[PDB]
Design goal:
This is part of a larger assembly, with 1 copy of chain A (723 residues) and 2 copies of chain B (402 residues). Chain A has 723 residues and is an alpha/beta fold. Chain A is built from 29 helices and 21 strands. Chain A starts with 9 loop residues before the first strand and ends in an 11-residue tail after the last helix. Helices cover 38% and strands 19% of the residues of chain B. Chain A: GO terms for molecular function: enoyl-CoA hydratase activity; long-chain (3S)-3-hydroxyacyl-CoA dehydrogenase (NAD+) activity; NAD+ binding.
């Protein structure tokens, strides 16, 4: 059966030549989504193709939205419990039964791809026999289900493996959910032909059908894997060539994932190889059973919550003041041409903003523009950009060594040294020089915005705009609200972050803000374990297997260890000045000892690792004797959980204290800002989604936290807001 | 009770992998040649009393498929009632066949059994049969599959065995294998392979390099370094062994077992069966044991298996006169020796697979018969035979001279 | 002594060859599913006491290569000390695993063992492993290789079993298999196969044709007539059986065993091991035997093996309450019945492979567990389980209800 009283989303049209045009046009939305309306509408359309097959000679699948077809229904997939595995299995089997029938009609079926075809969208086009894509800018084609903790369950795994073989389909298409430009898709083989405009798609599809029927009548509408002499590219698992390298596919995957508990890539590879061992229809059903295994799991719900719902609530303005309007930005003034300022000047000019990059010397200001040159040249050779885009935007960056040159600027972003006395004078020398209602942003990681704001006259326009290095690659912007920061200033900066294509979060002024404070608990746990006698190799493995992109001791070498020392000094000046006794973290002792030994990280030549000409080497051999590494061998999960729970608990405190206003900003801010493991869905989602030997959810998190506190210190006791 | 005794133990010479003397010889012919030799030694034995023929074989495909033990029963003219069963427990297959045969004798339901193995690696290479543990991604990913060679490098890394240490053991193996051949230790158990005309094909273990120098082993390249980096198996192994930062790749072709062809046969029976056939018992199977250890490092099975068979026999390490552990990789032997504090003078005294080769399915039966001869040659009492096994398994056997 | 007892015996349903429910299921998953079921039944049993896992498998290649028993030990989370060994004795492999496990228990060197088999013939077809007896001309020519089906037609020719006779037995098998399912005889031992989500894949033996008619079997074409004339195997068989002029080809797909997927598992241990683990013994292994008969006709092994195990146990045909012989071909069962004068009411009482299928490596363990249930269901005493084996081999086992 091709069915599971909704609206209809597919329009039928048969011309005099017998070619049917299925135009997908869901009325309940702006894009075509694989919802219940689609499953019923495609069911009727496929039934009618079979019934009227005596008067049908070809089919053209088209769309009426800006985009071809965009994935599945996330609002339904996220609610699938393990007891709903039968309903999930039946649903994707029904979807693929329709596509398989469309695929074996004995007639050519052409996909007319006008816009984006992502996930279920591309899977529909993969079920056709010929794909034509409009070479329009912004047209993405790919199978990004792995990024949501899912797999392409509508035949994406089965068909791409049939087209490309196990190795190419997994590495290039499936494992990372890569999105492809239309020219890229034509090169790899996802699309067969290109047209300049969307208006040429359907006529080219009808032209191709007429030519295919004349030239190749015997094989018209027959996929290559449905012919008797089909040979899978790269071979099947039983051929000697593939079977020689096949045992290295899970190991390389395990190496890429660093042992992190992300089950979707494992399932994709299992389904791809098990499917290549059997016939197409049996392979498709195997793919359905692995898909249900992912949807009913917790990790896919975490990623759907973060990378779909939380990210959409942020891009919609959940943290934007709900009353303000628009204010343009005519010129941007960047103070400091270091790693931060030069990158900030790049992404701002990349969006077309005029920049006056001010540094003390014109030679350093030119070197700040040179950071854009090395990026403009490396991006040119890769052919990503070329035609005057780099050159014109590089011309928008105007270096300057004079404070007077920052005239007419209505948006200041200071990215100089984190010293309040310095920033007070730098802003004081500039506020009278720039526009009256100009935004006065300050890129800071620790210093509170309320204190910095007392150095300007119009404090209502002073705000914290924390970027992350490298500025061109990092997507998060942490906007810090000062006590005097107006809501209009927040809206103007919120709109700027979306203009430079970055994701914003809004944070109220507090020590360490959200990102710096929470990531502090991460490195402090690792440094505590090293002082406790835990092997440094185990600490780094625990960090990588937790899902972090960089192990903590390596991260502690990048963050200058001398910089970490004076951050603790700033905190000890907050409690000792208030009278209360400071309870120091035992990680501070480990920092001072490495400072005392002259190994303050990578910047000063050597830290927890050894370094040789900008190339990090192995761990310092003297580390084991210095801290007696090996005298403490706790379970690896305890090490992983101590790091994860420390950031999770600290995130809850930030939610209690009003540092963050929403769990969406917590989850996305933790993932995009401090590298929190994506499989968790965020530092706040990790609590509601924790799964361990205690159970699943907030209750299991609390018991495991109380268990960690009983064996490693009272800092792991959960707050009252979780109880 | 029904004790099980070894009445005969023989083997072929081991032929090397490249331009080997045995490459032209079907694996079936290797087994039949040994059956013919057993007929030469006891031409009046009633072969109807032989109830089974048990052959280990790690790659039972092609020439070695279709229950090669039954093919050997029929091709050699053995009685049609004499059985024939193939088994695979990786490197311990040849010893598992001996253990199974001895256990069938103790049960009272079999009286006289042939056990042994055959592996023609020049014709049917390792991994020819496939397998889920390696080729099935879900199984491979879950069990953290790491090829044996990298597990062997991991053992040397964990235990502190340097490149010179493992190369030192490899030299010792070449020396003792050369001394055993020169002294005629093997003359009565290595049955030369001949063709259908009686012409000699191979009479010695042609993988041996008796002129190996410590300096010549030092020039060899680590074999498993191109497999570990390009396959990511190092990172898989270290995720399990997270306290080890780096894997030291000490193993090469000169300190690992050689890839060779060969077969072995052992005759096992009860005391009544041997007396009835005029056979003299050479040794008694004291006890057997199966155990295992972590399947990621793969090669630490011999120590639990040896301790289990020693507890079962009510014996200690000091009660054993000769320890024979297969030389799959040098670090496995050094590890086993450090685990149980084996006196170096008791360990692989006539050399091992590093010098003479390791024909997977046959090796266990080869090194068992090697121990029957050496116990008799030295007039010693007890020997312990064990092998490391892929997947982290372990098999050990204690024999007592009679 | 150390008697061996059966504590559990379970199996999967058998999935058919064409559009079968189990074609999407890896052979490894079939075994692990049964291991999981054994954990459901005794969740507090110490699995460290399990010393080995012995699995028969006739085509140990591809999905079934690389010692699938060790893969099952590791993939199921069983203790790393629990062994794992594959064996092949053709159709008797599943019963040879049970026999070997029982003999390891009697030896005293193993206390608790898993035995069984697995064969996914829809994924790894018969003959996928090759073999010298068929593919090596010298061996093939000397032993007069004749495929089993022609040996089965030869048995009917020699004994006078007509096309109607063998088709009559085939109908009886379909009826008794349908009555056994309808009466719930199999409900507690056939473990339904489910996917990784808990969803049902197969819960019944889908090869059965309960509506088979005598007239419908009469329309079937002799399967082995195109193989005998075009291959000349008829003339080979009649050179050995020179007093038979013509071979009557009576066997078809309707009176031969079906090609199916399936696995079986049996738990065997000593009385002390079962008492220590809180297990109740269901039956006792009385005796085992290996024998054989002429390898040209291939399928007359059950009669010598059955007579040998009966002499070993000190019993006669009249002392056995249930005879279970695998239904590879109808004429093999009729021959075995005429040889030993078996009362028809005792022979394959719940149906056999003709109706439910014959998954080579697993069948022996399936029909053994079938007999443990039926002895208990009827409150009978002794059962005898035997199978015909390619190459003319024979294996028989006597169990006694406890």
């Amino acid at each position: 059966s091709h069915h599971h009283m909704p609206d209809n989303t597919i329009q039928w049209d048969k011309d005099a030549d017998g070619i049917v045009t299925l135009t997908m046009d869901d009325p309940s939305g702006s894009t075509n989504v694989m919802n219940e309306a689609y499953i019923e509408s495609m069911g009727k359309a496929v039934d009618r193709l079979v019934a009227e097959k005596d008067s049908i000679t070809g089919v053209v699948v088209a769309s009426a939205k800006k985009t071809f077809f965009a994935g599945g229904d996330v609002k339904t997939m996220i609610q699938a419990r393990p007891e709903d595995a039968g309903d999930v299995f039946n649903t994707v089997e029904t979807i693929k039964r329709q596509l398989r029938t469309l695929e074996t009609l004995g007639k050519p079926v052409v996909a007319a791809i006008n816009g984006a075809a992502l996930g279920g969208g591309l899977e529909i086009a993969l079920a056709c026999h010929h794909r034509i894509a409009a070479d329009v800018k912004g047209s993405q084609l790919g199978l990004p289900e792995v990024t949501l903790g899912l797999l392409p369950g509508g035949g994406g795994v089965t068909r791409t493996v049939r087209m490309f073989g196990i190795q190419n389909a997994f590495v290039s298409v499936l494992a990372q959910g890569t999105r492809f430009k239309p020219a890229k898709a034509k090169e790899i083989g996802l699309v067969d032909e290109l047209v300049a405009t969307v208006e040429e798609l359907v006529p080219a599809a009808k032209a191709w059908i007429k030519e295919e029927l004349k030239a190749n009548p015997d094989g018209a509408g027959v996929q290559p894997w449905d012919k008797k002499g089909y040979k899978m590219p790269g071979g099947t698992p039983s051929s000697p060539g593939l079977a020689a390298i096949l045992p290295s596919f899970p190991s390389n995957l395990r190496k890429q994932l660093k042992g992190a508990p992300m089950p979707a890539p494992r399932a994709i590879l299992a389904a791809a190889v098990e499917g290549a061992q059997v016939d197409f229809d049996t392979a498709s059903r195997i793919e359905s059973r692995y898909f249900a295994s992912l949807v009913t799991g917790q990790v896919a719900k975490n990623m759907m919550q973060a990378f779909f719902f939380d990210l959409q609530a942020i891009n919609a303005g959940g943290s934007r003041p709900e009353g303000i309007g628009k204010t343009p930005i005519k010129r941007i003034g960047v103070l400091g041409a270091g790693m931060m300022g030069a990158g900030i000047a790049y992404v701002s000019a990349k969006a077309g903003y005029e920049v006056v990059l001010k540094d003390v010397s014109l030679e350093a200001a030119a070197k700040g523009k040179g950071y854009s040159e090395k990026l403009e040249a490396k991006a040119l050779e890769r052919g990503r950009t070329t035609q005057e885009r780099s050159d014109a935007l590089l011309a928008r960056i105007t270096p300057t060594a004079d404070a007077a040159d920052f005239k007419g600027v209505d948006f200041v972003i200071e990215a100089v040294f984190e010293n309040q006395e310095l920033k007070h004078k730098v802003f004081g020398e500039i506020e009278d020089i720039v526009e009256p209602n100009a935004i006065l942003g300050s890129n800071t990681s620790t210093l509170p915005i309320t204190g910095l704001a007392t150095g300007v006259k119009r404090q209502e326009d002073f705000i914290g705009i924390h970027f992350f290095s490298p500025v061109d690659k990092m997507p998060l912007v942490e906007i810090i609200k000062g006590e005097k920061t107006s809501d209009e200033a927040l809206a103007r900066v919120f709109d700027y972050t979306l203009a430079i294509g970055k994701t914003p979060i809004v944070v109220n002024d507090s020590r360490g803000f959200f990102t710096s404070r929470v990531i502090g608990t991460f490195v402090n746990e690792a440094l505590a374990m090293l002082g406790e006698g835990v092997e440094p190799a185990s600490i780094e493995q625990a960090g990588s297997q937790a899902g972090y992109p960089a192990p903590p001791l390596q991260l502690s070498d990048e963050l200058n260890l001398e910089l970490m020392h004076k951050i603790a000094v700033a905190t000890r000046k907050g409690v000792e000045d208030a009278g209360g006794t400071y309870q120091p973290h035992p990680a501070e002792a480990v920092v001072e000892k490495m400072i005392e030994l002259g190994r303050s990280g990578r910047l000063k030549g050597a830290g927890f690792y050894e370094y040789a000409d900008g190339k990090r080497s192995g761990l310092w051999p003297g580390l084991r004797e210095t801290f007696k590494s090996g005298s403490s061998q706790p379970p690896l999960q305890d090490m992983i959980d101590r790091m994860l729970f420390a950031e999770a608990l600290e995130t809850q405190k930030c939610l209690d204290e009003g540092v963050l206003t929403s769990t969406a900003d917590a989850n996305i801010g933790s993932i995009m800002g401090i590298g929190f493991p994506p499989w968790t869905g965020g530092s706040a989602q990790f609590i509601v989604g924790y799964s361990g030997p205690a159970g699943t959810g907030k209750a299991a998190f609390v018991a495991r936290a109380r268990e960690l506190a009983a064996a490693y210190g009272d800092r792991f006791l959960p707050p009252e807001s979780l109880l | 009770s029904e004790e099980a005794f070894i009445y005969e133990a023989i083997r072929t010479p081991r032929g090397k992998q490249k331009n080997g003397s045995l490459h032209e010889v079907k694996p079936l012919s290797l087994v039949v040649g040994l059956i013919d030799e057993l007929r030469k030694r006891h031409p009046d034995l009633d072969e109807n009393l032989i109830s089974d023929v048990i052959l280990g074989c790690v790659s039972p495909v092609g020439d070695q498929g279709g229950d090669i033990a039954r093919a050997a029963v029929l091709a050699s003219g053995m009685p049609v009632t004499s059985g024939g069963v193939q088994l695979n427990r990786f490197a311990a297959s040849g010893l598992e066949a001996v253990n199974t045969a001895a256990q069938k004798v103790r049960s009272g339901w079999d009286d006289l059994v042939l056990a042994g193995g055959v592996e023609s690696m020049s014709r049917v290479p390792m991994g020819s049969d496939g397998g889920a543990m390696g080729l099935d991604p879900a199984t491979n990913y879950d069990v953290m599959f790491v090829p044996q060679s990298i597990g062997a490098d991991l053992i040397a890394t964990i235990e502190g065995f340097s490149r010179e240490d493992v190369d030192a053991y490899a030299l010792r193996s070449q020396q003792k294998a050369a001394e055993a051949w020169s002294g005629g230790y093997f003359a009565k158990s290595v049955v030369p392979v001949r063709d259908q005309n009686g012409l000699l094909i191979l009479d010695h273990d042609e993988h041996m390099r008796p002129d190996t120098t410590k300096e010549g082993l030092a020039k060899l390249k680590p074999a498993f370094e191109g497999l570990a980096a390009l396959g990511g198996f190092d990172d898989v192994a270290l995720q399990k062994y997270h306290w080890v930062e780096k894997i030291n790749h000490v193993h090469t072709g000169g300190n690992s077992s050689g890839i060779v062809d060969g077969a072995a046969l052992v005759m096992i029976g009860s005391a009544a069966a041997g007396k009835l056939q005029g056979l003299t018992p050479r040794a008694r199977i004291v006890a057997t044991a199966t155990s295992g250890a972590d399947p990621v490092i793969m090669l630490t099975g011999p120590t639990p298996a040896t301790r289990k068979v020693l507890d079962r026999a009510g014996l200690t390490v000091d009660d054993i006169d000769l320890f024979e552990l297969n030389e799959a990789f040098a670090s496995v032997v050094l590890k086993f020796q450090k685990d149980l504090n084996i006196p170096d003078e008791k360990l692989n005294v006539n050399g091992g697979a590093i010098a003479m080769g390791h024909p997977l399915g046959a090796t266990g039966a080869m090194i068992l018969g090697t121990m029957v001869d050496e116990l008799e040659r030295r007039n010693a009492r007890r020997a312990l035979i064990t092998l490391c096994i892929g997947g982290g398994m372990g098999v050990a056997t204690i024999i007592e001279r009679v």
